[PDB]
Amino acid sequence: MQKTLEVWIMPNSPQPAEDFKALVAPFEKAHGVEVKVTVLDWGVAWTKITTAATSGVGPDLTQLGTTWVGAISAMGVLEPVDDVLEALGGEKAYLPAVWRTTRLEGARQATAVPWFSELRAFYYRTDALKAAGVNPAEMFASWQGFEAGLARLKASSFRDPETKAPLAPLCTPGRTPRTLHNAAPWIWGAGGEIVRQAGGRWQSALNSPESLEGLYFFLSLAQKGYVPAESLEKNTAQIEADFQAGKCAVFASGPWMIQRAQVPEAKGGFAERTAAKNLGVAPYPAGPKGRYTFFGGSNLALFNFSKNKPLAKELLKYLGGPEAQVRYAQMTGMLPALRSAWSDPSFQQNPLLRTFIQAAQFGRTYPSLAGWGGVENLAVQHLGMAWDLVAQGRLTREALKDLMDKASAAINQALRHHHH
Amino acid sequence: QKTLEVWIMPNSPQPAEDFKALVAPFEKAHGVEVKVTVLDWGVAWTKITTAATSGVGPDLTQLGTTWVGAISAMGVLEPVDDVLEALGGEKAYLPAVWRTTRLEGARQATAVPWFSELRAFYYRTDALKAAGVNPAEMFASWQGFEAGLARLKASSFRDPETKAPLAPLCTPGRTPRTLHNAAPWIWGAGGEIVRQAGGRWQSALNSPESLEGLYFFLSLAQKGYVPAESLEKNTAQIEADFQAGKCAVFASGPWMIQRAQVPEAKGGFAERTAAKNLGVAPYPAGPKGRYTFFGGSNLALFNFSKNKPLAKELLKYLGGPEAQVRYAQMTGMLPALRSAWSDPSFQQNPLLRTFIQAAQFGRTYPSLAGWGGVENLAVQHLGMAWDLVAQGRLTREALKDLMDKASAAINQALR
Numbered sequence: 165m166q167k168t169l170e171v172w173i174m175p176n177s178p179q180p181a182e183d184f185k186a187l188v189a190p191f192e193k194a195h196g197v198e199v200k201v202t203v204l205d206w207g208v209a210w211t212k213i214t215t216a217a218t219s220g221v222g223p224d225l226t227q228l229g230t231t232w233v234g235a236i237s238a239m240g241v242l243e244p245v246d247d248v249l250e251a252l253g254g255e256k257a258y259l260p261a262v263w264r265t266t267r268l269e270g271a272r273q274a275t276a277v278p279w280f281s282e283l284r285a286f287y288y289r290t291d292a293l294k295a296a297g298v299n300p301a302e303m304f305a306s307w308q309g310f311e312a313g314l315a316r317l318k319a320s321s322f323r324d325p326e327t328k329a330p331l332a333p334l335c336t337p338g339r340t341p342r343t344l345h346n347a348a349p350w351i352w353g354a355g356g357e358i359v360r361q362a363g364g365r366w367q368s369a370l371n372s373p374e375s376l377e378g379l380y381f382f383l384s385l386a387q388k389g390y391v392p393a394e395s396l397e398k399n400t401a402q403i404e405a406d407f408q409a410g411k412c413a414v415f416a417s418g419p420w421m422i423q424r425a426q427v428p429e430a431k432g433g434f435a436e437r438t439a440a441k442n443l444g445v446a447p448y449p450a451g452p453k454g455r456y457t458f459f460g461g462s463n464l465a466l467f468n469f470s471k472n473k474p475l476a477k478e479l480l481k482y483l484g485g486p487e488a489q490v491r492y493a494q495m496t497g498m499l500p501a502l503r504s505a506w507s508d509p510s511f512q513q514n515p516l517l518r519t520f521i522q523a524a525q526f527g528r529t530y531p532s533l534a535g536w537g538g539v540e541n542l543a544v545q546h547l548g549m550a551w552d553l554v555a556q557g558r559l560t561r562e563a564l565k566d567l568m569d570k571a572s573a574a575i576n577q578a579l580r581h582h583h584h
Numbered sequence: 585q586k587t588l589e590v591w592i593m594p595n596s597p598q599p600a601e602d603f604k605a606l607v608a609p610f611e612k613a614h615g616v617e618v619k620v621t622v623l624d625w626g627v628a629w630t631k632i633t634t635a636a637t638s639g640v641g642p643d644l645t646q647l648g649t650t651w652v653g654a655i656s657a658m659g660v661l662e663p664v665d666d667v668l669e670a671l672g673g674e675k676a677y678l679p680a681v682w683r684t685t686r687l688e689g690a691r692q693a694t695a696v697p698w699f700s701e702l703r704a705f706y707y708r709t710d711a712l713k714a715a716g717v718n719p720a721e722m723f724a725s726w727q728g729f730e731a732g733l734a735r736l737k738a739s740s741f742r743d744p745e746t747k748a749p750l751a752p753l754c755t756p757g758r759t760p761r762t763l764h765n766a767a768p769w770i771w772g773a774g775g776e777i778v779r780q781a782g783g784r785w786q787s788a789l790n791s792p793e794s795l796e797g798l799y800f801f802l803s804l805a806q807k808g809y810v811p812a813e814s815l816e817k818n819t820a821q822i823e824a825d826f827q828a829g830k831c832a833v834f835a836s837g838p839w840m841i842q843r844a845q846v847p848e849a850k851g852g853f854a855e856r857t858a859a860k861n862l863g864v865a866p867y868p869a870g871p872k873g874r875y876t877f878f879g880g881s882n883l884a885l886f887n888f889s890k891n892k893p894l895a896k897e898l899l900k901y902l903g904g905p906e907a908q909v910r911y912a913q914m915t916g917m918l919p920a921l922r923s924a925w926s927d928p929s930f931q932q933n934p935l936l937r938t939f940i941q942a943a944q945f946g947r948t949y950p951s952l953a954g955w956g957g958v959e960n961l962a963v964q965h966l967g968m969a970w971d972l973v974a975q976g977r978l979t980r981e982a983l984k985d986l987m988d989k990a991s992a993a994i995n996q997a998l999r
């Protein structure tokens with residue numbers, strides 16, 4: 165009689181359950197085990213997983229957003245996995261920013277295994293930058309280059325072959341709960357932070373001089389006319405669609421866009437579109453105090469009430485290990501969490517994927533705080549209010565500061581009060 | 585027989601029956617009978633404060649969000665940080681909802697969010713089109729909002745059923761709930777009702793910013809955008825005016841969408857032109873932000889309950905995704921649990937998706953032990969301002985004199 169494992173996942177791929185079943189079929193056959201998968205929508209998964217955690221009833225393994233690992237770990241419900249991580253190559257096998265997501269900030273033991281990475285780089289229309297007299301090497305080297313290329317792109321008379329209309333220099337989604345991830349590399353590039361440690365404790369640094377320098381740099385590009393009004397009312401998926409449809413010279417996204425450029429519109433790609441035929445990518449530019457690439461993605465964790473910790477740890481080793489890492493990265497359009505998988509020919513043979521790997525070298529993530537959730541909700545609320553000012557062309561440095569002082573007061577309250 | 589006692593307010597069309605249907609799977613899972621008592625809002629206030637003073641009551645009681653401070657300060661509520669952690673803690677709630685879980689500045693949570701009231705603008709897509717008003721522009725900013733109202737007053741459009749023109753905006757000022765209508769204009773202007781600054785709580789109703797927002801809103805009626813009859817009417821009469829084709833624009837909660845889908849015989853308005861030409865938009869950005877008024881109700885557990893562990897299990901069930909979606913449908917409210925909005929029920933209606941967009945700007949009153957006295961004073965003096973508005977008599981100086989007066993009484997109350 166087959167042994168049993170349960171895994172909870174979020175919709176990471178086109179057929180989430182079927183794809184995950186294909187991924188683990190070799191493990192099932194090797195260990196005489198059936199892996200039962202349950203797919204949770206990203207919006208409900210957190211509450212289902214905290215109910216599972218507190219009730220002691222749920223799967224053996226659960227997917228976690230990297231930003232979730234601290235909160236769940238602090239609940240005391242996760243089995244240590246330093247053994248699994250040592251088996252996969254240890255701390256050297258991971259980008260530093262990925263290794264940071266294996267534990268609660270400052271915790272003694274690892275409680276999550278890196279599964280896949282989300283990271284962001286600039287896609288750009290090679291035809292638009294040429295028509296504008298912009299060298300992508302200079303546009304994506306520095307903030308000065310970045311703004312100077314957007315200026316030339318706003319001036320350009322170039323029209324998309326299919327829309328027969330000019331392109332927005334830059335598109336960025338003004339309407340999303342994931343707005344912080346888009347701001348983070350500007351905050352970081354200026355020497356800033358969203359939170360930082362002081363007086364025995366974590367606090368907001370959103371109102372620091374450097375954070376405010378980076379936020380204003382980024383948000384002010386929109387008030388300078390480089391971002392259309394229309395973008396700031398749109399979500400991440402709408403902005404991707406705008407870039408495929410020739411509306412945007414430049415936008416930030418993950419590696420998944422490359423695969424979409426290879427497949428026809430009917431298959432949910434955009435290979436027929438001008439943008440697919442004129443596609444470049446660049447890492448985020450260096451800011452005044454450094455160059456940072458936002459990283460997110462998902463990790464896997466083992467509940468301490470699992471009835472088969474050794475077999476589940478074999479599944480964590482399989483899913484975290486070289487073959488599964490390359491296959492699931494293909495299925496999801498993500499970057500492997502395991503550094504060694506970046507050397508796979510399926511990344512090295514595509515120059516656009518090679519660029520994502522160059523951008524990966526600058527990877528940076530949020531501190532893995534037990535209270536990150538509340539921090540991010542408060543930051544997102546106030547960032548939303550800053551974009552409103554940008555839409556009316558009313559974002560001053562002073563008005564930005566007043567918004568971030570307000571966010572900082574609420575974040576510091578949240579951090580002080582984080583339960584248990 | 586395991587039993588729990590729960591006190592609720594009339595939140596749904598058959599309050600008791602609907603609540604019994606909601607908990608029936610909990611009752612069956614745990615062999616518990618949940619005994620529900622429905623109390624009208626005023627009656628509930630007296631009985632809950634008596635239960636708090638006497639140590640005799642139900643296990644669980646519904647509280648208005650704005651009641652949590654007052655009842656918590658009486659020291660009678662069991663902490664529920666554990667229940668809230670099970671439901672996903674601070675992450676699983678909008679920040680304005682999370683604030684209603686405790687007395688302002690308290691460490692420990694004492695109430696569990698049950699459902700959220702929030703306010704957005706409903707509009708006649710046909711009326712706006714006939715007036716040459718773009719709803720995304722009209723509802724982006726105060727400037728767009730006033731400009732759209734002016735065009736709507738000028739329009740020759742007539743409701744197809746009434747064969748008569750539409751009032752540009754309908755709102756009450758004949759209601760004890762007048763502060764909730766005013767709150768987003770106060771907040772949009774950079775104002776507040778009360779502010780903690782300088783080490784204590786104080787009225788900010790006479791702040792330049794609060795006065796700029798109050799006057800912006802109240803003056804729209806004197807400019808001819810709100811008809812005379814609207815100011816003699818309560819919240820339900822304004823709903824009826826909009827369903828009957830009399831109003832281009834009015835503020836309500838998500839229940840109107842449900843009602844637009846249901847025939848008049850089932851207490852909806854699906855047959856009426858307004859149901860067939862229905863749009864929703866968030867409140868507009870003011871000079872210092874965009875804010876959506878949040879209220880609603882929470883559940884609390886009395887610390888004298890003999891059934892605290894079982895009651896906490898019922899708190900987890902009622903606060904959790906399945907019961908959160910079902911009770912939002914029964915009441916026509918938004919779930920308090922942000923996770924529950926990911927239910928197909930919400931994601932699969934464009935009008936409800938717009939409420940969830942407006943939800944991102946959620947704001948609530950501070951969870952003050954003395955809130956009710958603060959709100960009574962604010963509502964008395966706002967009521968006086970609306971009386972002047974009905975007579976076309978409001979000035980910035982008259983408004984200021986009224987809010988100076990409310991602020992003196994509020995600061996005494998807060999001391």
Ligand SMILES: OC[C@H]1O[C@@H](OC[C@H]2O[C@@H](O)[C@H](O)[C@@H](O)[C@@H]2O)[C@H](O)[C@@H](O)[C@@H]1O
Pocket residue numbers: 206228229230231232282459460461462
């Ligand atoms: O915020 C939690 C978690 O979010 C992760 O991304 C979530 C996001 O994933 C997209 O690819 C998907 O299309 C969206 O529907 C979904 O919301 C993120 O990578 C993690 O770092 C983060 O912890």
Ligand SMILES: OC[C@H]1O[C@@H](OC[C@H]2O[C@@H](O)[C@H](O)[C@@H](O)[C@@H]2O)[C@H](O)[C@@H](O)[C@@H]1O
Pocket residue numbers: 625647648649650651701878879880881
């Ligand atoms: O002030 C207490 C409490 O009031 C709640 O509003 C009550 C209100 O709800 C309507 O849906 C109902 O039709 C009215 O008759 C009833 O008065 C409010 O949502 C809470 O935030 C507040 O604390």
Ligand SMILES: O=S([O-])[O-]
Pocket residue numbers: 597598599600601602622
């Ligand atoms: O109408 S009865 O269900 O309270």
Ligand SMILES: [Cl-]
Pocket residue numbers: 335336337346415416
């Ligand atoms: Cl962006």
Ligand SMILES: [Cl-]
Pocket residue numbers: 357358359529530531
């Ligand atoms: Cl940070």
Ligand SMILES: [Cl-]
Pocket residue numbers: 776777778948949950
């Ligand atoms: Cl306030």
